[PDB]
Amino acid sequence: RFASVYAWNRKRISNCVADYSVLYNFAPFFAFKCYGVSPTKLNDLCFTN
Amino acid sequence: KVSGNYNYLYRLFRKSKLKPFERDISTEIYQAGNKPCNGVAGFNCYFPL
Ligand SMILES: *[C@@H]1O[C@H](CO)[C@@H](O)[C@H](O)[C@H]1NC(C)=O
């Protein structure tokens, strides 16, 4: 039930272990343009929310 | 620049730590993952600068 562009549902996630590795086995990831934060280092840099 | 100052670049990907007072001028491809990138610079192979 993916939402549309006009109305997006925000999810506040403040208690879990952010393992950004299982996402690699979700799709070939055609569009993976990332910003200043390095994709290869995400486990070391902890985020407030 | 009002449009963009695409004259400065900086490295995000390095194999290991950088000892003081040395340089890493290198236009290579960062071979992350198992796929042996051969200059394709596709998925999991991103331009370090
Ligand atoms: C520095 O030397 C190592 C080992 O010889 C080599 O792998 C690396 O590419 C070199 N880097 C530069 C910037 O010369």
From Swiss-Prot, chain B:
According to the record, mutating residue 43 to V results in:
In strain: Omicron/BA.4, Omicron/BA.5, Omicron/BQ.1.1
Mutation effect (residue 9 to R): In strain: Delta/B.1.617.2, Epsilon/B.1.427/B.1.429, Kappa/B.1.617.1, Lambda/C.37, 19B/501Y, Omicron/BA.4, Omicron/BA.5, Omicron/BQ.1.1; Contributes to cellular immunity evasion and increases infectivity
Q: What is the effect of changing residue 9 to R?
A: Increased resistance to neutralizing antibodies. Decreases HLA binding to NF9 epitope. Increased binding affinity to human ACE2
Ranges for region Receptor-binding motif: 1-49
Q: List the disulfide bonds.
A: 37-45
What happens upon changing residue 10 to F? Answer: Decreased HLA binding to NF9 epitope. Increased binding affinity to human ACE2
* Recorded superkingdom: Viruses
Start and end residues of each stretch annotated as Disordered: 12-47
**Which residue intervals make up region (Immunodominant HLA epitope recognized by the CD8+)?**
5-13
What this protein is reported to do is described as:
Attaches the virion to the cell membrane by interacting with host receptor, initiating the infection. The major receptor is host ACE2. When S2/S2' has been cleaved, binding to the receptor triggers direct fusion at the cell membrane. When S2/S2' has not been cleaved, binding to the receptor results in internalization of the virus by endocytosis using host TFRC and GRM2 and leading to fusion of the virion membrane with the host endosomal membrane. Alternatively, may use NRP1/NRP2 and integrin as entry receptors.
Describe its partners and assembly state. Binds to host ACE2. RBD also interacts with the N-linked glycan on 'Asn-90' of ACE2. Cleavage of S generates a polybasic C-terminal sequence on S1 that binds to host Neuropilin-1 (NRP1) and Neuropilin-2 (NRP2) receptors. Interacts with host integrin alpha-5/beta-1 (ITGA5:ITGB1) and with ACE2 in complex with integrin alpha-5/beta-1 (ITGA5:ITGB1). May interact via cytoplasmic c-terminus with M protein. May interact (via N-terminus) with host bilirubin and biliverdin, thereby preventing antibody binding to the SARS-CoV-2 spike NTD via an allosteric mechanism.
Protein name as annotated: Spike protein S1
Which species? Severe acute respiratory syndrome coronavirus 2 (2019-nCoV)
* Range within the parent protein: 444 to 492 of 1273
